[model samples]
Target chain A: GSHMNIITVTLNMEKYFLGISIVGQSNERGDGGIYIGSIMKGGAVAADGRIEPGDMLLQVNMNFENMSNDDAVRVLRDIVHKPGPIVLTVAKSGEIVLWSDIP
Target chain B: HMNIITVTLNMEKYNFLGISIVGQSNERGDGGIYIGSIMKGGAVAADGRIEPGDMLLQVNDMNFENMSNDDAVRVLRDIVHKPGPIVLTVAKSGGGGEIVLWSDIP
Candidate 1:
């Protein structure tokens, strides 16, 4: 059977799932640079609690340097079911800074 | 000015796969729209169509109603490269009106 691009896995499905967080700035494009747009479906928030429509995405898990959108998605997908806390670094407009947590 | 143009040229070559801009906005700050240009030419899901400036209103039956523009873009890629119909509700430009079209991954 062909593997579905995304699937719901059991909480115990370690090999098939990994947990991760996606971070981006408030004014960057949703799909710009290393931001994963879909991760928010699982509930990651933006800094300043705004998470507006056109915010920039800054970083993920301290891996902001030289990262692309595909890179972020791959990293997160690789650890979807793993046990660990994912930290995201985000920047908002007006110089407000904050961090959002994900499980 | 030459340097700035050079920089723009350098950035334009590679297509950004997941990001997009809002082509339309509403006064209430709700139900705004985004336009994603097909960079490399791909298939559209069933009930999905893309016009030159059509607003991507909904994806996979998720009414973008009241959803942030970023949220809609995120949902769009969540099903990228997947085998399923992407239901798109679009509003064409110049009062072209709303219409639904379908395409699938080939």
Candidate 2:
């Protein structure tokens, strides 16, 4: 399934992932890793317990690849369409670090 | 000093975002990596913050090139100094530089 079971970052009608911020080289151009950055207190990420400040994100469903504004937004729609608790695969440690419960 | 800087990308830190950064030189001699091209990939690409033609002026607290022939050092050494949060000071289309990351790069 392209919608592989992984971590899900939720959004409002505007398609913005609430709470945490993602960081890297260029937001407009395809570049390296989307490291989890600052978490907004009242935002969606902060309110959720699935993500953390230092945790690394693996995939949204199963589409972890270079994304354009339009393509990336397409990913969001696929995720929201799924049911259940938007499970995500994050790494607290290791390569493609997907879901490790460590300090 | 030619304002050049570091860009630490600890492989263990983030993962895959397909970053393509390269070093550029001033025909006059200044050196260090310039934002020749950036593709739509990670956190930086998500928000459309950075652009091409921008140069790295600072990486964290270290300077790459401060607009000089000599101060312009290779960016790799500084980037390797630590497992990092990789903060960069990028000069946009403007003359002065501004600190940018996925919070804020070019």
Candidate 3:
């Protein structure tokens, strides 16, 4: 029963959860932040509805310590290859205030 | 008088402008839409001319006359779908500056 559930979960992950795309920053070169580029419209992340473009991925099950853009993408892919809950710690995008929304 | 300057940002692959606009009631009390800060790795920072105190007067052809912060955000969001150069008309909040020779004379 446990094996069956694991296999099914892996299949579901590979099939339905490849939606978020990211860009890396080199530690010594660029600003050194792995930022989300875009989330596929109507895809898993988009449907889940928490992530947005410009949000920094601070931790994806682990602190993305000193990672370049390519390293970040690889780590994200590794997580997708396995069957487990992917916990992400993201820094939300900067706030944009809408004057009309305030009193 | 404050000088009006134009800046053309090349939108190659960036979607976010990497900017934060003034938001607090006291900051935006005068209804002036101004640039609050620029993100280090953002498009605005990459361009390196737009500063924290610059007031947005126009973007492309959209004049900001009486436009609210909500409406301004909507326009910026729309720019993500737009391609090519994004021109900005800004009123510098500083001492006297030179007027660029280029002008959209009517």
**Of models 1 and 2, which has the larger DockQ?**
1
Which tens-of-lDDT digit does each residue in A58-93 have in candidate 1? 443435435554565566566543455443343332
**Candidate 2 accuracy as TM-score:** 0.31
Q: What's the lDDT of the predicted structure labeled candidate 1?
A: 0.36
C-alpha lDDT of all candidate models, in order: 0.36, 0.44, 0.56
Tens-digit lDDT track for model 2 on B42-82? 43334344554456566566664443322333333334336
- Taking the candidates one at a time, how many backbone clashes does each contain? 29, 40, 1
- Candidate 3 — number of clashing residue pairs? 1
Interface RMSD against the true structure, candidate 2: 14.9
lDDT per residue as tens, model 3, A1-103: 3321110111224335645666775553435877666554324554355565677777765556467666666667677556665556666764233321111
Q: Which stretches of candidate 2 lie over 4 Å from their true place?
A: A1-103, B1-13, B27-33, B67-74, B77-81, B94-106
Report fnat, model 3: 0.21
In terms of TM-score, which candidate is strongest? Answer: 3
Say which prediction, candidate 2 or candidate 3, comes out ahead on TM-score.
3
